[model samples]
Target chain A: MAGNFANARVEKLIRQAGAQRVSADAVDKMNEILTDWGKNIAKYAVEIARHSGRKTVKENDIKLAAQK
Target chain B: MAGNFANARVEKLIRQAGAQRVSADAVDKMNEILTDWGKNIAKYAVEIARHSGRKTVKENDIKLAAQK
Candidate 1:
């Protein structure tokens, strides 16, 4: 069960960033935070999009949402 | 290309969070930030792991990395 993300890809990201390799614990933690932030941003972005009379959340919506 | 992420899944996350749908622009922005943050965290975690004499970045390394 690798979950929704690819650990190898995550490891590759880490390697490119600096590390030569990555552990499962770090990969999972990264996924955890990424998921959390994504959900929060989505929620905020949605509110702004709906307020602007748009059913689809836009880049502008996300920008406005994250600032506050 | 839809990118390395699943836009429908991203949209689903948004829907569960609040919105019924999402736009490509917002999804792309979400990915943009996620990628940026993930890379930064990995780099920091790696440095900490190496400092601790560990080749593999661990959860503790990530925790320490995010604090600063």
Candidate 2:
């Protein structure tokens, strides 16, 4: 609902990275890409945690999911 | 700054990605790696845009930056 990320945060991220200037569209696009990627990782991580009979997801699960 | 990522989100992402489990160290490592990569890409993309005499960084700049 809140666009997954804030424009200010994205702007700051780009600036901190080294960009002197950033486009609104670029920020939007990045948000979209990262948001989608994040969702995929989250879903798989949950599955991984549950698959192992764990109630809580752990970093190991995330690492394996990322590898997958 | 705020650890660059949240454990909850990282957990969710790993689960979504298909990992059966995760470790604390692994999440920390992933966060560090991603944060570093993001910064590098942002820095290079800024340089790329500047070299092109543009005031703003765009998707192409990011795409090209990633390739480099």
Candidate 3:
């Protein structure tokens, strides 16, 4: 799958995480993983909001859902 | 539980996708769903990579894992 995150950003994040060197494969995987994860979360957040008779999502709802 | 994405970004995304108005509840559910999906995909990708004798996951691994 195509990654939504920038390769540079992934590299920077890896370094920020204290990795000395990050392989291209690692960077790409991380990017893809994060992108897919974020999209799914967004999908669920929308559902939760709609079910609650609201059109907007709140941070607290996301927090509650993440625990499940 | 905390969303990695900004609430504003999610709002923008919903609007960009043709939503005129989004409630706080919708945003939160989307965040949770996306987060969980991404984590699962990442986990499966890692397993695929390991099975393939690679220390790092590649795009193909994610693609295959996502399909499964």
Candidate 4:
């Protein structure tokens, strides 16, 4: 995956899904979704990732990350 | 050019460069770059386009679009 701080939250999610279990293609899909709704996703993901002490994003964490 | 509001600014950037003169391929490159750096670039681009009197994007307007 092309890693960056901007995408750190989603990356964590993939790792959480079990780095072995989640495919790079899945991460790519996540990236695509986030890119499409980035204005919303980034604002949420950054805040949650920062507050939760988690360094990357996973699919399950998406909702939590998005919560205020 | 795909004319979404997020990309509207860069669209202006292209237009400023002279729509007739600017090749479609060049605009595609600009779109690709913006897609990759959508976060920093979008925030800046949107604001500039909103404030500027113009509605359509041109190449010359990119600098102005990226400003705070």
What is the DockQ (computed on Cα atoms) for candidate 4? 0.02
lDDT of 1 by residue, A1-28 (tens): 2223455555566767777667887777
- Give the per-residue lDDT digits (tens) of candidate 2, residues B1-68: 22244545544455445545556655564455445556776777788898999989997877777778
Q: Candidate 3's residue-wise lDDT over A2-68, tens digit each?
A: 3443466555554444343446766676666666555555566556667777754666545644655
Off by over 4 Å in 1: A1-4, B1-8
Q: Stretches of candidate 3 above 4 Å error?
A: A1-68
lDDT of 4 at A47: 42
Can you give the lDDT of residue A26 in candidate 4?
A: 70
Question: TM-score of model 2's chain A, to 2 decimals?
Answer: 0.83
Candidates sorted on lDDT, descending: 1, 2, 4, 3
TM-score of each: 0.82, 0.65, 0.54, 0.23
> Please, what are the lDDT tens digits per residue for candidate 3 over residues B9-43?
65565555444366666665554454445555556
Q: Assign candidate 3 its CAPRI class.
A: incorrect
* Alpha-carbon RMSD, candidate 2: 4.2
Residues A18-66 of candidate 4: C-alpha lDDT, one tens digit per residue: 7866665676778877676756776666544433445776564476545
